[PDB]
Amino acid sequence: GSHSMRYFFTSVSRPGRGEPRFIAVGYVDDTQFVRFDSDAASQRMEPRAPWIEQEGPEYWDQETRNVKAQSQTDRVDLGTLRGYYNQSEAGSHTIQIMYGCDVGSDGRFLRGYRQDAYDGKDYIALNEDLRSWTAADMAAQITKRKWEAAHEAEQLRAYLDGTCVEWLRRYLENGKETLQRTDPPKTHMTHHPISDHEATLRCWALGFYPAEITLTWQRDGEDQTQDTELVETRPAGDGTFQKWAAVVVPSGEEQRYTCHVQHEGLPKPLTLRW
Template sequence: MALKSGSWSDPSRPPTTGPRPGTHSLRYFYTAVSEPGPGLPEFSAVGSVDGQRIAHYDSATRRMEPRAEWLARSEDTQYWDRQTQVLQGVQPMYHANLQTARQRYNQSAGFHTLQLMYGCERRADGSIRGFRQFAYDGQDFLSLDEERETWVAADDGAQITKRNWDADRSIAQGYRAYLEGTCIEWLEKYLAYGQETLQSRERPRVQVSDRPIRDGLTTLSCRVHGFYPRSVAVVWLRKGVAVPQETIQWGVVPSGDGTYQTRATIDIDPSKETDYTCCVEHPSLPEDLRVPWVPKSCMMLIVGIVLGVLVLAAAVAGAGFSLRKKNGGYKAAAAHDGSASS
């Protein structure tokens, strides 16, 4: 038994629109589970453009439905009926594929997942690429080598599928043609539909904090949140020089309000160096945003200076008030400097 291939693709070919700046992507995600339950359907499919979810299907509703208002306005009932029919056909195929994968790994029971991610990307320089990747239980299983038109097995369990699909070269050729042709055309069409929403910009907000860990070391954390689109670059600078090898990236995740968030950390020895700055690059920013780390000792000094200035100002104000009172109050003081009216 071999894994069967299946994809969500429309046979019609939408008109190609003009080029747009920036990097854009169209991605589809399929998930099949061996033990479905409340809130976890046996099969689900999600489509997204530039990280924004646009459509959803699952085995409970058995219906492809829009998740982006701009797509719901732009496509008619026939479009959603076609997508629904395709996925209703794909659903049993992925159930069978999951059973096949369990046999490959000698697993007869338990919770298991089979996932597929496929789609295409057009970069700012106009180049394009496609991708089609399977995962089993969250680990790489099989992927398409688009250039060589062959399949790459991640482990021994995927070797049988690789051999079967490599034996029929038309499988890889067909997917490459779809990913580099139809997929890109649909991406352009979706970008035209959702231009106002997809090209909106939300500036990132940055918070820098520190936490002592061990042996005198400290972890600096740079939390970046509230930004859109998803594309962002965060790195720590030491004395103004980027140290990407020492920066730990924690991935970009949705915030739940249509924006994204991420975090970058670095472990330092504050007794040797304290000049660290978090640097953020994002399409909404005219130039990179830099937020320096201020050690607690420096912060206490700054707070002390500010408090000292406030106390001094209060003392000066109090002395002035006392002087005016001795000279007969506000009007007397004003008459003394020649500014009072008769």
């Protein structure tokens, strides 16, 4: 299978309460391995996965320096954009940045991406061709022209096919015991009578990795998406994920419904019947 490394950054302007809050998190495919909090006491890049703690002090110094650089740039951009939209100085605003790169099973570079948002709306993104930028509003056209004049797309592309992919290969080779595993989901089913007429028949799948899983309901061959209420895949906390999908069924015909679970850790898509 393919793999991916991503970095998430959130800067929140809290005027009057000091300098903006800045939080940075690093993920390898689903696993958080580095983090940084602008309010943390260490003020350093901290490990969060057991397979990243084995890096030398030079690595941690470099990552700390780069994180603080990102924080400085984002703290400047907060005021820049607050002035762009003529927004009040007392309002709290949020900049969110995500960038990363994907690799294949043999370790070859597949694609890369960067996306920046302001207050939860898309601000500026890197196109699929890794050579142009897509801007949402007129304020983002300024940043688009600014980054085009600064050859930023080329430098980012040189970062993606190089440093990014190489460090992702290193991370996959170092934490191969837990990052290349495929935990199959353990499935079961519960039945809760809502009233004397209808009942909720819930289909559970627990302890699977990664989080990509498909839960479907069938009434004798056809998928009925009129009552299927899926739920955000939640982290168990130990490294696995959980997900349930329920359906409201008239009491007396629970035997006509089937739950189908599709996951990469299962040879055949399982079928559950109450």
